[PDB]
C-alpha cells in the first residue's frame, strides 16, 4: 500500500477527508443482505488490519470476501479516492483474478455525505462475479471538511457536529511544557497563566517573556483543534516580529490522557512557539461499537443519537414525582449538551436530578460484550468522579440489551437503582437475530417502468414481465434492455425475489440467469454495443477482415479503430433494484444507480409504499412528570369528536389505519370538508413531543397548506385524571391555521395466590407461572461467574438440591448438601405498580456482605410482552453479592395497557 492520501479536491472547490474511517485495529464488516453466507471485511485507505483469526485475507488486500471457501483478495489500494460521476469513488485493483481470467478483481466504494447514523458501515449493493464489486458507504466522514471558528473553548464540526470543548483545561495554574531545561514554558489554554503577567497565554517564566496575549478564539480543521495566541514579546536575533504560541490538539486513546503540552519545535527564524497536545477532548471517539459472535456482527452503531442522548426512566418503588430529567445515556461516544444540561467531558451516561451538580455516572470502558450463554449484549461504564461510599474511584453503570422485535428502536429504561451500580435495560429490535423470508412484494407489480441513463433505456418491472411486447426478446424477463436490438433479459422473473436489509431502511431486490452479459475482451477492456463499423450498427461480435469473432472497444470502430478478439465467458446479465424508503412519492422513479460493462443495472427506487410505519415514540419524560400515552394509542381507526362538519381521526404513538378516503390517510390526523376535498393535518416525521404547564406540546406541521409558507399545525392540550375523559373540540387561530383540542388520559401522570393490582381494583392471572401445582418447573440457571447462580420463582416447595431454608431463590454452584446461598427467603415479599413494569421484592430476611442489615431485597421484573409464549429468564447483575437483580419475560403479565 504505497501510501495513498485519503483526501482529494473536488472540481467545485471542495475537499473531502475519508481518513476518519481508516481503522487499524478491527477493519469494517460490510452490511450485506439479510441471510448471506458471505462476509466482506473491508478497510478504506489501508490494506486490511490483521484479522488474526484462522487464515486471514492476503496481506495486501484492502477489500476481502470471507465466508464458505478461502478469503479472496477483492483488490489493493491503487490511488487516492476520486470525485467521479457526482459521488466520492475509491477504486481498489490487483485482486485474485475472476472467471474472466484477464482482469484482476476490482472494488469501488460509493461514499455519500449523511448525518443519519454515527458509525455507518459500507453497505453491499452489487455482486457481479466478473471482477467488480460496488459498496455504498453512507458515512458522516464523506462530507466536505470545513473550518469552524468560535469565540470560546466550545467549537463545533460543521460536517458531523461532534462537540469540541477544552473547558476541562480552563484553569489559571496552567501547564509546564519543557524544552531542554534552560527555560520551562508556563503555558495555559483558554485562560491566564500562573507564573507570568495579566492576560498571558504562554511564556518561559524565569524572565516572563510573554508570547501568548491569551484569548479563547478556538478554531478547528478535520479533527485538529488549535488555539491562536498572537501579540507576544519582540525578537532579539531578527527583525521586530511578535512572539506567538499556536497550540495543536490531536486525538489519542487513553495512554496518559492529560500529559504535557510538550513543545515540539520553536521558530527563532520567524518567532513562533509550536506546542503540541494529545487529548481525549479533540476526538470524535475511536471506540469501536461492534461485537463478533462467529459469523454475525451483533452491533449497536445505529443506536447513537447525533445531537445529544436518550431521556431514560429510573425504576424505584417510591412516592416521588420521579426526577424527570434524571438520566441521559449515550452508547459508544460521550453526550452532547442542551438547554438545562451541563455534565463534564467524556460523560457517556449523565445524571441531572433536582438541585443537581454535574455527576458523571459512567464513561466508555471498552467495546460492547455479549454473554455467550444467553442472547443479550452488555456495556459497562466506569467513571473518575467517585461513589458516595469512597471504596471505588467510580460510579458504575451497566446497560442490558434484550431483543424486542418490531420497528420501535425504543428508549433505554433504568431498573431498580442500586447502591453503587446503575443497571439499565434497553429493549431494541437490533439485538434480535436477522430473519426475513421471501413472500411479500403485490403493490408495485401494477406498472412497469423504462428509465434511462445514457444511450440505453432499461425496461424494469418487479413481480411481473417487463418488455415482452416492445422488442420480443425477453418473455420471462422482469428487467430487460431496450437499445432497439431486442429484449436482453437481465434476469428471469421467478429467479429471485430478494428481501430486506436493516440499517439502510431499504429492500434490495435482484434478478439473474436471464441472458449472457457482454464479456467480449482480449485485454480486459469490454466492448460496448452497437458500434457502427463499415456503416453497420453491429449488435454482436463479427468476423470481418480478421480470424475470430472480434469487437470494437468503442460505440464506433470507424472513428476510433480500438479493437480486439471476443472471448465470451459463462457470465450472465444481473439486475439489482434497491427499495430505499422516502416520504416523496408512493410510486418512486427508479433511476440507474451504477453501471459496469452493461452486465449490471442498479436502481435506487425511492418508494413510500414498501418501508415501515415508523410511528412516533410516545415515551418522553420532562419537568417533574413521566408521560406514556399508550392508552390513547388507537391501533385500527381512531376517535371522532369534532362538530360543524369534520371527520376527526387522531394518531398518537401511531399512523391512521382505517381513515376517511380522498385524503393522506397514512401520514397523520385528517379532517373532512363536507362534500368536497378532505384535509390532512400533518406528516409522519413532524410529531414534536415536549410539555409546558400541564399541557403536552403535541403538533402536526407540514400538512394542509393554507397558503404555501405557513400551514395547519394543531397545538393540542391534555390533562390527567382518575377516569377516562371524553374528548371535546377546541377553537382555532386563522392567522397561523393552529387548531386546538381537549383530551384526558390515565397514564399522562404479598404476591402469594393469583396477582392482584388495585390500580382500578382489578386482579390478574399469575397462575400460569406461579406454579401452585408444579413442583420443579421454576428451577432456571444462568451463568454469572465461575460461581454459577440458580433461581426458582415463588413456589416454596421441593428443596431439590440445597439445604436452603424456606426460600424461592437459592443460588447454587451445583452444590447439594452445602448452604448454597440464603438470599431469596419468603418470610415477607411485596411489590408495587408502575405503568409498564412491576417490582416484586423481598425485605430483610437473611444477611450477607458487610452487614448493613438491609441488603436482602432480590428484585424480579416481568415485562409487558405477551409474544414470548413461554418463560426462560436470565440473571442481569449483582448488588454487593447479597441483594441481586434479574429480569424475566412472561406472556400473562400486563393488564390495562392498550
Short mmCIF file of C-alpha atoms in Angstrom, two decimals, residues 317-504:
data_model
loop_
_atom_site.label_atom_id
_atom_site.label_comp_id
_atom_site.label_asym_id
_atom_site.label_seq_id
_atom_site.Cartn_x
_atom_site.Cartn_y
_atom_site.Cartn_z
CA UNK A 317 -40.54 1.82 44.24
CA UNK A 318 -41.20 5.32 45.71
CA UNK A 319 -43.78 8.15 46.35
CA UNK A 320 -41.86 10.90 44.42
CA UNK A 321 -42.54 12.79 41.12
CA UNK A 322 -39.67 10.57 39.70
CA UNK A 323 -36.93 13.25 38.95
CA UNK A 324 -37.98 14.00 35.28
CA UNK A 325 -34.52 14.83 33.74
CA UNK A 326 -32.76 12.20 35.98
CA UNK A 327 -30.66 10.38 33.24
CA UNK A 328 -29.16 10.94 29.73
CA UNK A 329 -27.43 7.92 28.05
CA UNK A 330 -25.05 7.53 25.06
CA UNK A 331 -23.59 4.14 23.84
CA UNK A 332 -20.07 4.44 22.21
CA UNK A 333 -19.42 8.26 22.35
CA UNK A 334 -19.84 10.92 25.11
CA UNK A 335 -23.03 13.08 25.35
CA UNK A 336 -23.82 16.40 23.57
CA UNK A 337 -25.37 19.01 25.93
CA UNK A 338 -28.52 21.21 25.52
CA UNK A 339 -30.68 23.78 27.48
CA UNK A 340 -30.71 22.73 31.20
CA UNK A 341 -27.94 20.10 30.53
CA UNK A 342 -24.27 20.52 31.66
CA UNK A 343 -22.14 17.47 32.76
CA UNK A 344 -18.39 17.23 32.10
CA UNK A 345 -16.05 15.95 29.30
CA UNK A 346 -16.21 12.20 28.42
CA UNK A 347 -19.61 11.71 30.22
CA UNK A 348 -21.15 8.65 28.42
CA UNK A 349 -24.10 8.31 30.90
CA UNK A 350 -25.04 11.58 32.73
CA UNK A 351 -27.31 12.22 35.79
CA UNK A 352 -29.16 15.59 36.38
CA UNK A 353 -31.51 15.33 39.44
CA UNK A 354 -33.20 18.33 41.23
CA UNK A 355 -30.65 20.65 42.99
CA UNK A 356 -28.23 18.67 40.76
CA UNK A 357 -24.45 19.10 40.39
CA UNK A 358 -22.91 17.59 37.19
CA UNK A 359 -22.42 13.95 38.43
CA UNK A 360 -20.81 11.64 35.79
CA UNK A 361 -22.15 8.06 36.48
CA UNK A 362 -20.28 6.45 33.52
CA UNK A 363 -17.56 6.82 30.84
CA UNK A 364 -16.93 4.41 27.87
CA UNK A 365 -14.86 1.48 29.32
CA UNK A 366 -14.45 -0.54 26.07
CA UNK A 367 -16.38 -2.30 23.23
CA UNK A 368 -19.80 -3.98 23.88
CA UNK A 369 -19.51 -7.63 25.17
CA UNK A 370 -22.08 -10.50 24.74
CA UNK A 371 -22.69 -13.26 27.36
CA UNK A 372 -22.07 -16.43 25.24
CA UNK A 373 -24.69 -18.29 27.46
CA UNK A 374 -27.82 -16.12 26.76
CA UNK A 375 -28.91 -13.89 23.78
CA UNK A 376 -28.26 -10.43 25.46
CA UNK A 377 -25.33 -7.93 24.95
CA UNK A 378 -23.91 -5.79 27.85
CA UNK A 379 -21.96 -2.49 28.01
CA UNK A 380 -20.25 -1.48 31.33
CA UNK A 381 -19.35 2.20 32.09
CA UNK A 382 -16.63 3.03 34.70
CA UNK A 383 -16.12 6.66 35.97
CA UNK A 384 -13.49 9.01 37.58
CA UNK A 385 -15.74 11.06 39.97
CA UNK A 386 -16.13 8.55 42.86
CA UNK A 387 -19.11 6.78 44.60
CA UNK A 388 -20.72 8.42 47.74
CA UNK A 389 -19.01 5.48 49.51
CA UNK A 390 -15.28 6.14 48.61
CA UNK A 391 -14.10 2.44 48.37
CA UNK A 392 -14.12 2.74 44.49
CA UNK A 393 -12.92 5.74 42.32
CA UNK A 394 -16.06 5.39 40.07
CA UNK A 395 -19.85 5.46 39.74
CA UNK A 396 -20.51 2.20 37.75
CA UNK A 397 -23.30 1.96 35.08
CA UNK A 398 -24.24 -1.18 33.03
CA UNK A 399 -26.84 -1.36 30.15
CA UNK A 400 -28.60 -4.71 29.27
CA UNK A 401 -29.81 -5.37 25.66
CA UNK A 402 -32.81 -7.79 25.37
CA UNK A 403 -34.43 -8.47 21.93
CA UNK A 404 -37.81 -6.68 21.36
CA UNK A 405 -38.98 -7.18 17.71
CA UNK A 406 -40.89 -4.58 15.62
CA UNK A 407 -39.62 -1.19 14.27
CA UNK A 408 -39.59 0.92 17.54
CA UNK A 409 -35.83 1.14 18.48
CA UNK A 410 -37.21 2.40 21.85
CA UNK A 411 -35.81 4.36 24.86
CA UNK A 412 -33.44 2.78 27.46
CA UNK A 413 -35.06 2.14 30.90
CA UNK A 414 -33.07 2.02 34.20
CA UNK A 415 -34.05 -0.90 36.55
CA UNK A 416 -34.01 -0.84 40.44
CA UNK A 417 -31.46 1.97 41.22
CA UNK A 418 -28.83 0.05 43.32
CA UNK A 419 -26.14 1.18 45.87
CA UNK A 420 -23.11 2.00 43.56
CA UNK A 421 -24.11 0.40 40.14
CA UNK A 422 -26.95 1.71 37.85
CA UNK A 423 -28.11 -1.31 35.78
CA UNK A 424 -30.25 -0.14 32.77
CA UNK A 425 -32.19 -2.45 30.38
CA UNK A 426 -32.81 -1.21 26.77
CA UNK A 427 -35.26 -3.30 24.63
CA UNK A 428 -34.22 -2.85 20.92
CA UNK A 429 -35.02 -4.91 17.76
CA UNK A 430 -31.26 -4.56 16.81
CA UNK A 431 -30.33 -7.37 19.34
CA UNK A 432 -32.76 -9.85 17.63
CA UNK A 433 -31.08 -12.28 15.15
CA UNK A 434 -31.66 -11.46 11.42
CA UNK A 435 -34.63 -13.41 9.88
CA UNK A 436 -36.79 -12.17 6.92
CA UNK A 437 -38.15 -14.57 4.20
CA UNK A 438 -39.35 -14.08 0.58
CA UNK A 439 -43.22 -13.74 0.48
CA UNK A 440 -44.34 -10.03 0.11
CA UNK A 441 -43.83 -7.58 -2.84
CA UNK A 442 -48.16 -7.22 -4.68
CA UNK A 443 -48.43 -3.38 -4.66
CA UNK A 444 -45.55 -2.41 -7.11
CA UNK A 445 -46.35 -5.01 -9.88
CA UNK A 446 -49.26 -2.83 -11.26
CA UNK A 447 -46.87 -0.72 -13.51
CA UNK A 448 -43.61 -1.43 -15.47
CA UNK A 449 -41.01 1.42 -15.90
CA UNK A 450 -38.46 2.31 -18.68
CA UNK A 451 -35.89 4.74 -17.14
CA UNK A 452 -32.57 5.57 -18.95
CA UNK A 453 -29.04 6.85 -18.09
CA UNK A 454 -27.06 7.34 -21.36
CA UNK A 455 -27.76 5.71 -24.80
CA UNK A 456 -29.61 2.62 -23.30
CA UNK A 457 -33.17 2.63 -21.77
CA UNK A 458 -33.51 -0.27 -19.23
CA UNK A 459 -37.15 -1.55 -19.02
CA UNK A 460 -37.74 -2.83 -15.41
CA UNK A 461 -40.72 -4.29 -13.50
CA UNK A 462 -40.93 -6.13 -10.13
CA UNK A 463 -43.07 -9.33 -9.70
CA UNK A 464 -44.23 -9.17 -13.44
CA UNK A 465 -42.82 -9.46 -17.05
CA UNK A 466 -41.06 -6.27 -18.34
CA UNK A 467 -40.69 -5.86 -22.16
CA UNK A 468 -42.13 -9.00 -23.98
CA UNK A 469 -44.28 -6.91 -26.43
CA UNK A 470 -41.81 -3.98 -27.02
CA UNK A 471 -38.89 -5.95 -28.64
CA UNK A 472 -39.87 -9.70 -28.49
CA UNK A 473 -36.55 -10.73 -26.82
CA UNK A 474 -37.49 -11.37 -23.12
CA UNK A 475 -40.90 -13.06 -22.35
CA UNK A 476 -39.72 -14.19 -18.82
CA UNK A 477 -37.60 -11.04 -18.09
CA UNK A 478 -38.53 -8.82 -15.08
CA UNK A 479 -35.60 -6.46 -16.03
CA UNK A 480 -34.93 -6.02 -19.82
CA UNK A 481 -32.86 -3.70 -22.13
CA UNK A 482 -34.39 -1.53 -24.94
CA UNK A 483 -31.49 -0.41 -27.24
CA UNK A 484 -33.71 -1.35 -30.27
CA UNK A 485 -31.73 -4.64 -30.85
CA UNK A 486 -34.05 -6.90 -28.74
CA UNK A 487 -35.16 -7.60 -25.13
CA UNK A 488 -31.87 -8.53 -23.37
CA UNK A 489 -33.20 -10.41 -20.25
CA UNK A 490 -31.13 -9.04 -17.28
CA UNK A 491 -32.82 -11.67 -15.04
CA UNK A 492 -35.71 -14.21 -15.00
CA UNK A 493 -38.95 -13.16 -13.15
CA UNK A 494 -39.01 -16.32 -10.90
CA UNK A 495 -35.13 -16.43 -10.49
CA UNK A 496 -35.08 -14.29 -7.26
CA UNK A 497 -37.42 -12.19 -5.02
CA UNK A 498 -34.79 -10.73 -2.61
CA UNK A 499 -35.80 -9.11 0.73
CA UNK A 500 -34.88 -6.53 3.46
CA UNK A 501 -31.58 -5.20 4.90
CA UNK A 502 -31.79 -3.34 8.26
CA UNK A 503 -29.57 -0.21 8.64
CA UNK A 504 -30.18 1.13 5.05
#
